[PDB]
Design a binder for this molecule. Structure first.
Ligand code: Q49
Length: 185
């Protein structure tokens, strides 16, 4: 792909994070802590899952960024509406304001309702995410496999400002402690 020139510098918003996440000083890395991270509760925090939003809001234009997922067993990545539900249980779907893919139990799936099987021959270590607000497109690229397309959501109905969306995945297994990292431009 030739989307690299729409690169944007994403930083994580501490205030949206689940209370067990640890965000690095530079706001470019996030990982699951082994306990509550000693922060106050607020209405922005995701309560049920280890999720956090980027600080940036997008309402026009073309945007591209990359995330490092090396050695993780589980994660969700993409964009969401600024007004998505934060508390309680919910599915990642466009109807709920999410445009996402994920890894879970050795399979990759797109967050459609119901979910769509992805066909990945080379397990990605870094994922590229492209958003075209006007066109209604969210695309995912396999940076480890020369930028090969993973999945395109088209005819998206964003219906609001978008924020970068992250889930570090649960760590019940002891094999999913590694961070999500925003990769340099
Ligand atoms: C080993 N464990 C136990 C808790 C953590 O999972 C979570 C993460 C966020 C919210 C939540 F309610 C639970 C995990 O991966």
């Amino acid at each position: 792909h030739h989307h690299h020139h729409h690169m944007v510098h994403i930083t994580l918003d501490r205030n949206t994070a689940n209370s067990w996440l640890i965000i690095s000083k530079d706001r470019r890395q996030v990982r699951m802590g082994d306990t509550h991270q000693n922060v106050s509760d607020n209405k922005e925090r995701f309560s049920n899952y280890p999720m956090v939003l980027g600080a940036q809001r997008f309402s026009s234009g073309k945007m591209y960024w990359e995330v490092d997922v090396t050695q993780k067993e589980a994660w969700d990545l993409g964009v969401c509406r600024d007004s998505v539900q934060r508390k309680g249980q919910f599915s990642l779907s466009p109807e709920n304001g999410f445009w996402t893919i994920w890894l879970w139990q050795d399979s990759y799936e797109a967050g459609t309702s119901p979910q769509t099987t992805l066909h990945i021959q080379v397990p990605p270590c870094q994922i590229g995410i492209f958003v075209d607000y006007e066109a209604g497109v969210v695309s995912f690229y396999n940076i480890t496999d020369h930028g090969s397309l993973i999945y395109t959501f088209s005819e998206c109905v964003f219906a609001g400002p978008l924020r970068p969306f992250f889930n570090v995945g649960f760590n019940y297994s002891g094999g999913n402690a590694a961070p999500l990292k925003l990769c340099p431009l």
